[PDB]
Structures are given as C-alpha cells and as structure tokens.
Amino acid sequence: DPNLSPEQWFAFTPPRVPVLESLQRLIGSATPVLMDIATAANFPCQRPFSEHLGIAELPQYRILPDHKQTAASSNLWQSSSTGGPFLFTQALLRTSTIATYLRGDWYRDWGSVEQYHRLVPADQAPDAVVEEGVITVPGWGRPGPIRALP
C-alpha cells in the first residue's frame, strides 16, 4: 500500500480452500424461508413462511437479490413503516451471513443468504395457543381503522 490517502487500505486475512455444499442441501425445501420479491421465481422448492389466523411463522433463513437491487428496492419495499415482514423479522430475530458462490461463474454478484437466530430462545418463550371462533357480521359495519401509520 503506497498511497497516503486516509481512505486507502485493505486489512486482509489468511487464505482458505472452502468446502462447499449445494444450497438445496443446506436449506432443504422444508424450513421456512423469506425470499425477497426478485429471488422468488428462481427458488421454487424452498417454501415461504405461512400466516395462519393473522399470526406469522418466524422464518429461519433469508435469500436476497444482488447489492444494487437490495439497496434500491427490496429493503425499502418490505419496510416496517409500510407493513412488510420486517415488521417482525427485525424486532424478534437477529441476522447473520453465509458465504455463497455461484457454481462455475466466479465473476457473478448474485444475491446472498442470511441466517436467523431468535433473540429470546423458544425454550423459554414458546408459541401461543391462540383460540378460534366464529361470528356473523353484516356487510356495512366497520370496527375502526387499521393502524396503517409509519
């Protein structure tokens, strides 16, 4: 490093020959995933998390698009001030990152994968036993608005 500007440096780390495995063997098409809007037609075996009776199911992974796409669309479409899944995947989970490559194409910046860990482990904060019933309402009544505020 011969340049003396205060913003030129690189801070490396030792080399390694990684041991790789497919993403289908890692995730497995049976765990809940949060695919973004762009990366959801390319992964048709991974299943998204369900929303039964107005209560969501916490995902375990997350698949993102590339950097220019994530910074521009995916992070500010699914916000929490607008109602996206970041409403509760940012208040209840903690994210990490996994090193992923595209087979054969080492020049390609596709996406990324991120793992999710609970903030409060489910051994002391288990799930709810939400009840269920049925009523009859007319077609003109409205019981107040939804808090659709930022």
């Binding site: 993403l23 995730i27 992964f43 048709p44 075996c45 996994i98 490559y101 087979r103 054969g104 994968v113």
Partner: peptide
Amino acid sequence: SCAMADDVLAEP
C-alpha cells in the same frame, strides 16, 4: 427440479 438452489454453493 430446483432451478437455482442447485447451482448455488454455500459454505456453512
């Protein structure tokens, strides 16, 4: 067949 979940390698 998984389309892209098979051409993507990962390092756990």
